Write a protein that binds this ligand. Structure first.
Ligand SMILES: CCCCCCCC/C=C\CCCCCCCC(=O)OC[C@H](COP(=O)(O)OCC[N+](C)(C)C)OC(=O)CCCCCCC/C=C\CCCCCCCC
Ligand SMILES: CCCCCCCC/C=C\CCCCCCCC(=O)OC[C@H](COP(=O)(O)OCC[N+](C)(C)C)OC(=O)CCCCCCC/C=C\CCCCCCCC
Ligand SMILES: CCCCCCCC/C=C\CCCCCCCC(=O)OC[C@H](COP(=O)(O)OCC[N+](C)(C)C)OC(=O)CCCCCCC/C=C\CCCCCCCC
Ligand SMILES: CCCCCCCC/C=C\CCCCCCCC(=O)OC[C@H](COP(=O)(O)OCC[N+](C)(C)C)OC(=O)CCCCCCC/C=C\CCCCCCCC
Ligand SMILES: CCCCCCCC/C=C\CCCCCCCC(=O)OC[C@H](COP(=O)(O)OCC[N+](C)(C)C)OC(=O)CCCCCCC/C=C\CCCCCCCC
Ligand SMILES: CCCCCCCC/C=C\CCCCCCCC(=O)OC[C@H](COP(=O)(O)OCC[N+](C)(C)C)OC(=O)CCCCCCC/C=C\CCCCCCCC
Ligand SMILES: CCCCCCCC/C=C\CCCCCCCC(=O)OC[C@H](COP(=O)(O)OCC[N+](C)(C)C)OC(=O)CCCCCCC/C=C\CCCCCCCC
Ligand SMILES: CCCCCCCC/C=C\CCCCCCCC(=O)OC[C@H](COP(=O)(O)OCC[N+](C)(C)C)OC(=O)CCCCCCC/C=C\CCCCCCCC
Ligand SMILES: CCCCCCCC/C=C\CCCCCCCC(=O)OC[C@H](COP(=O)(O)OCC[N+](C)(C)C)OC(=O)CCCCCCC/C=C\CCCCCCCC
Ligand SMILES: CCCCCCCC/C=C\CCCCCCCC(=O)OC[C@H](COP(=O)(O)OCC[N+](C)(C)C)OC(=O)CCCCCCC/C=C\CCCCCCCC
Ligand SMILES: CCCCCCCC/C=C\CCCCCCCC(=O)OC[C@H](COP(=O)(O)OC[C@H](N)C(=O)O)OC(=O)CCCCCCC/C=C\CCCCCCCC
Ligand SMILES: Nc1nc2c(ncn2[C@@H]2O[C@H](COP(=O)(O)OP(=O)(O)NP(=O)(O)O)[C@@H](O)[C@H]2O)c(=O)[nH]1
Ligand SMILES: [Zn+2]
Ligand SMILES: [Zn+2]
Lengths: 132, 198, 185, 198
């Protein structure tokens, strides 16, 4: 009885459920290790014939009924999915830009992603730093 | 309904393709086995003969290569000697010029710079005088320009008030009812999108 | 960005998941929780360039799995983590090593021996024992502990260093029977 | 419709702009006079001093040019003669190499080519047999693949028609009422939009 537990971004933690463990029960384990709140979280099951929307389930749903299925938790509390973060700070070492042919001194960098770009490059790139 | 309807046909297509895939892989692998085995049989020819014939082939090349290296070694010595003796003279002639022409160029450089220095002495002072004359002119004229600029800016600011107060008020008084008119059309349009696309 | 596939293996109770949690999440654990399929991701800028560490945790409590053989084959750097407070883990190292050899279809792969729980007074396995065994296999050995968190950061870096040398060595060799295999840069 | 109101506001700005332009240009022209005449006060002395400085500067530069020119005649010219000598020496050295080693290199090439004549050529003949057997197998398997492809084509065509018939029928019978529905949506959409944008 294996359950595919997926977290935001691309984190996966397949745990071993037995006897009778609900979604909330399993998430209670990860919650302490991750150190977050289930308040802004929502449980979504595998996409079952859809154009592009996550079907929400319940917290009392048994994980045994989702054996082999991929269950992902997303931040449905105002704006879902992992968005790009705009933070300005130095880097660990002088590197090159991922947009222009120059060195990256003091620009912008994401927390979830972690891209390397200049201040101008912020809106110079039409692609998000989200990797699969 | 249409999605499920069409999906049903796609499913049958997948099934038929899968059913056909069986024989296909068997047939393909069957011919592939003739190709793999053929290459295996030929391996005792391609690789085997290339391994046996590579012996006299590489031997001939290696031997000739050794001869080439031997000849190169026997040539590099006298040639390097020629290069050394030649370089000794070639560099000697250069040195024989680097001393006199070098010293001469050095002394000439002194004169070159000396002439410039002697000329730059009055020029630098005059340049400062010129700069001072310009700076003073630009200071007096600049003061007049700035004073006038400030006046013009104040006048433009006064006329700007006609845009910040009357014009802005007019814009506000015009936008207010317009926004209401636009809101009505916007709201009704929202309904359309929830009527036709729903 | 540079991508490095890191797969960790070890016996159930060597602190395999503890090292990862205390490294990426910087969190400490207490209750033992059998890990089946976990993976951490971080876009770190080592030496300047952006490097994505694709770490994959395995199940310490398991025999043979077809699925394991699959994803373990897509790995480059392997960490042989074991607890020095238990001789069982020391012996299991050989089994895990042989397993990888078959899966990777190679006798020489980027593997690093890591002795976890080295700060504990229950030192059953001595450093010289593992170091000598490692030296006779051509693998590096680093002492670490998820409790103290000392050397964990460099331990994972050491693996990357092995991977970089592996690819270089491979290009300078060509998978041939060469007695001399000592080249770098 | 209320654009006539906004037009008046736009006209007001333009009118005030002209009321600004007039005085502004008048004083700006006087400003330009201050600038032009002022700059001319600098430029007059500038130009006069330019001639007074460029003349001796040219003389000074000419002297340096002459100096360097004469120096190049006593340096470059002799150095060229010696360069030619060194070149002649090197050419001689090269000639004494390109002749023996030249024939030697060609001789080595002969030894290489002569080897290749018995290394590549004969091997190519063996390769002909190998490639013949390879292409033979490719033709044998190719012939089988031809039968497979043809058979698979029939099997694919039969399944194609098997699905195409009911698919096209259901598509037509599905799009029929759907197009009628679309008409209902379109008609109502157009009608309502014409009222919103009336
Ligand atoms: C303009 C008015 C409508 C006109 C008609 C429709 C036009 C559609 C054209 C483009 C669509 C743009 C918007 C796409 C939104 C995708 C949302 C999505 O997220 O959907 C799920 C996938 C899979 O992940 P998830 O479901 O777990 O996340 C779900 C996260 N949430 C709930 C935000 C749903 O999101 C992901 O994969 C993340 C990566 C991006 C996935 C985009 C999937 C877009 C789906 C269809 C677009 C193409 C349709 C035509 C295809 C023709 C193929 C021949
Ligand atoms: C068959 C496949 C065809 C693929 C090409 C279709 C081309 C269609 C024609 C024009 C569009 C070209 C560009 C299409 C870009 C698709 C990007 C995409 O695949 O997105 C997929 C995601 C999936 O869900 P997610 O949860 O991963 O993303 C959540 C994003 N979040 C945070 C809003 C909600 O859904 C979203 O991104 C939702 C949208 C996010 C970005 C909104 C940007 C709004 C501003 C401007 C849009 C301008 C559009 C072009 C206008 C042209 C006018 C002439
Ligand atoms: C955004 C909307 C969609 C756009 C789609 C198109 C791409 C758009 C993105 C960029 C446009 C590029 C336009 C063309 C010019 C740029 C090409 C390029 O790509 O600029 C990047 C590459 C790779 O970055 P880098 O690290 O090299 O430069 C590092 C430079 N520094 C020292 C700062 C940090 O620069 C290099 O590649 C140069 C160095 C490597 C040269 C290798 C030459 C190999 C020659 C033959 C081998 C061919 C193999 C073919 C099969 C390959 C199978 C894998
Ligand atoms: C006759 C007329 C003559 C006109 C002459 C003057 C105009 C000439 C036009 C362009 C000048 C280009 C000059 C060279 C620019 C090199 C940029 C470059 O070398 O960049 C390299 C970086 C490398 O990054 P990496 O190695 O770390 O990653 C991996 C990179 N890789 C996948 C190669 C694996 O990658 C990147 O910078 C790209 C990062 C993503 C950038 C997305 C930008 C999206 C916006 C617009 C797209 C425009 C596409 C235009 C396509 C034109 C096709 C003909
Ligand atoms: C009208 C006003 C124009 C104003 C100027 C506009 C820009 C062009 C002007 C002059 C042309 C040359 C510009 C050179 C700029 C260099 C900037 C720079 O200091 O970069 C430094 C970085 C980082 O240090 P590092 O990597 O050297 O050392 C790494 C550590 N260590 C040394 C051990 C090596 O390295 C690098 O950026 C290496 C980057 C290599 C690729 C350069 C690609 C340049 C692309 C086009 C040429 C410029 C076209 C301009 C077109 C203007 C149109 C109006
Ligand atoms: C106003 C019009 C409508 C605008 C609507 C809004 C914008 C459009 C809407 C959405 C944006 C869609 C953009 C689609 C293309 C994105 C390209 C791209 O992905 O952008 C970023 C990449 C980053 O790459 P990464 O490796 O960092 O991450 C790789 C991460 N992953 C795994 C997942 C790939 O950029 C790269 O990959 C670098 C790739 C470099 C390829 C160089 C190829 C060179 C080949 C030929 C060049 C010949 C040049 C000849 C001389 C003239 C040149 C002009
Ligand atoms: C296979 C080689 C065939 C070669 C044939 C001969 C020619 C070869 C030429 C060049 C050689 C290219 C070799 C490329 C090798 C890598 C391919 C690859 O990397 O394969 C997987 C990636 C996605 O890997 P991943 O992210 O897990 O990264 C995993 C790695 N790690 C952790 C950084 C991010 O494939 C991608 O990246 C695809 C791009 C995904 C972009 C995702 C984000 C999109 C963002 C916005 C969408 C905007 C849409 C706008 C509307 C578009 C309408 C069409
Ligand atoms: C307004 C000009 C009117 C000219 C005609 C009337 C002239 C009247 C007489 C004199 C005029 C003097 C104007 C002096 C303007 C100085 C502007 C300036 O030196 O500013 C400097 C600041 C610097 O940074 P910061 O201190 O703001 O931030 C600091 C953030 N921290 C602290 C992190 C440090 O930056 C800024 O003030 C940002 C300023 C942005 C101004 C945007 C104006 C846009 C208006 C029109 C755009 C189109 C113009 C062309 C129209 C053609 C139509 C046919
Ligand atoms: C654009 C349209 C293309 C259409 C198809 C034909 C393209 C022809 C153009 C160029 C030839 C590309 C030939 C690619 C051959 C397979 C390369 C390959 O699959 O590399 C896989 C390895 C896998 O990972 P790794 O850990 O083993 O290597 C880590 C990096 N590493 C090498 C240095 C240790 O990644 C690597 O090698 C690192 C990446 C570089 C690998 C270079 C391999 C070069 C091998 C042969 C060169 C070509 C010889 C024949 C030329 C005939 C000319 C007529
Ligand atoms: C029955 C008849 C069968 C006939 C079959 C013919 C084809 C056979 C194919 C492969 C067999 C290769 C056998 C190689 C045997 C020698 C291997 C080797 O030992 O070789 C070593 C060298 C040097 O190695 P070292 O200097 O490290 O050591 C030097 C150590 N000491 C100083 C002693 C000098 O290395 C090398 O021979 C490597 C030479 C190849 C390098 C490829 C690099 C590819 C990289 C990028 C690809 C770019 C492609 C671009 C395409 C588009 C272009 C426009
Ligand atoms: C019935 C509607 C119901 C609601 C519908 C909502 C959705 C609407 C969306 C799409 C429907 C319309 C779809 C229209 C598709 C048009 C496709 C098309 O015609 O392509 C070609 C045209 C050609 O224009 P023209 O011939 O002017 O220019 C040709 C060009 N000079 C040449 O020949 O080289 O390109 C152009 O006209 C572009 C420039 C036009 C300039 C004049 C533009 C003139 C525009 C309006 C005229 C004034 C209207 C004033 C207000 C009236 C209502 C109060
Ligand atoms: N004192 C100390 N405790 C450790 C050390 N490493 C792990 N532990 C502890 O051992 C317990 C279990 O750790 P865990 O990583 O889950 O063990 P594991 O071998 O990875 N099990 P699995 O492979 O199933 O995930 C936790 O309390 C963890 O903190 C260590 O080096 N020192
Ligand atoms: Zn940049
Ligand atoms: Zn980002």
């Amino acid at each position: 009885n294996t359950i595919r537990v997926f977290l935001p971004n691309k984190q996966r933690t397949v745990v071993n459920v037995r006897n009778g463990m609900s979604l909330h029960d399993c998430l209670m384990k990860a919650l302490k290790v991750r150190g977050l709140q289930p308040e802004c979280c929502a449980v979504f099951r595998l996409l079952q014939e859809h154009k592009g929307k996550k079907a929400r389930l319940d917290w009392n749903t048994d994980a045994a009924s989702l054996i082999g299925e991929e269950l992902q938790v997303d931040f449905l509390d105002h704006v879902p999915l992992t968005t790009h973060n705009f933070a300005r700070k130095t880097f660990l070492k002088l590197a090159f830009c991922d947009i222009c042919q120059k060195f990256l001194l003091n620009g912008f960098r994401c927390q979830t992603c972690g891209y390397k770009f200049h201040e101008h490059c912020s809106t110079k790139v039409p692609t998000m730093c989200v990797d699969w | 309904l249409k999605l499920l309807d069409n999906w049903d046909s796609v499913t049958s297509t997948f099934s038929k393709l899968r059913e056909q895939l069986g024989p296909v892989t068997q047939e393909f692998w069957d011919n592939l086995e003739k190709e793999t085995e053929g290459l295996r049989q030929e391996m005792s020819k391609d690789l085997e003969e290339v391994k046996a014939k590579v012996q006299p082939y590489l031997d001939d090349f290696q031997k000739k290569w050794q001869e080439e290296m031997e000849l190169y070694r026997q040539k590099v010595e006298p040639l390097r000697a020629e290069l050394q003796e030649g370089a000794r003279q070639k560099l000697h002639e250069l040195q024989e010029k680097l001393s006199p022409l070098g010293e001469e160029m050095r002394d000439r450089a002194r004169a070159h710079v000396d002439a410039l220095r002697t000329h730059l002495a009055p020029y630098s002072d005059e340049l400062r005088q010129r700069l001072a004359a310009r700076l003073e002119a630009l200071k007096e004229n600049g003061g007049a320009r700035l004073a006038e600029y400030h006046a013009k800016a104040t006048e433009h600011l006064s006329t700007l008030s006609e845009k910040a107060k009357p014009a802005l008020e007019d814009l506000r008084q015009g936008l207010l009812p317009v926004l209401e008119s636009f809101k009505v059309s916007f709201l009704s349009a929202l309904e359309e999108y929830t009527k036709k696309l729903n | 960005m540079t991508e490095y596939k890191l797969v960790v293996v070890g016996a159930g109770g060597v602190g395999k998941s503890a090292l990862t949690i205390q490294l990426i999440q910087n969190h400490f654990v207490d209750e033992y929780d059998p890990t089946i399929e976990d993976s951490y991701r971080k876009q770190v800028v080592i030496d300047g360039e952006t490097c994505l560490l694709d770490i994959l945790d395995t199940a310490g409590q398991e025999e043979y799995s077809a699925m394991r053989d699959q994803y373990m084959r897509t790995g480059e750097g392997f960490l042989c983590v074991f607890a020095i407070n238990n001789t069982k883990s020391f012996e299991d190292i050989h089994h895990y090593r042989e397993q990888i050899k078959r899966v990777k279809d190679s006798e020489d792969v980027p593997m690093v021996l890591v002795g976890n729980k080295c700060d504990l007074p229950s030192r059953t396995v001595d450093t010289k024992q593992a170091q000598d065994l490692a030296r006779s296999y051509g693998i590096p050995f680093i002492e670490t502990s998820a409790k103290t968190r000392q050397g964990v950061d460099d331990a994972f870096y050491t693996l990357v260093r092995e991977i970089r040398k592996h690819k270089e060595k491979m290009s300078k060799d060509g998978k041939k029977k060469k007695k001399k295999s000592k080249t770098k840069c």
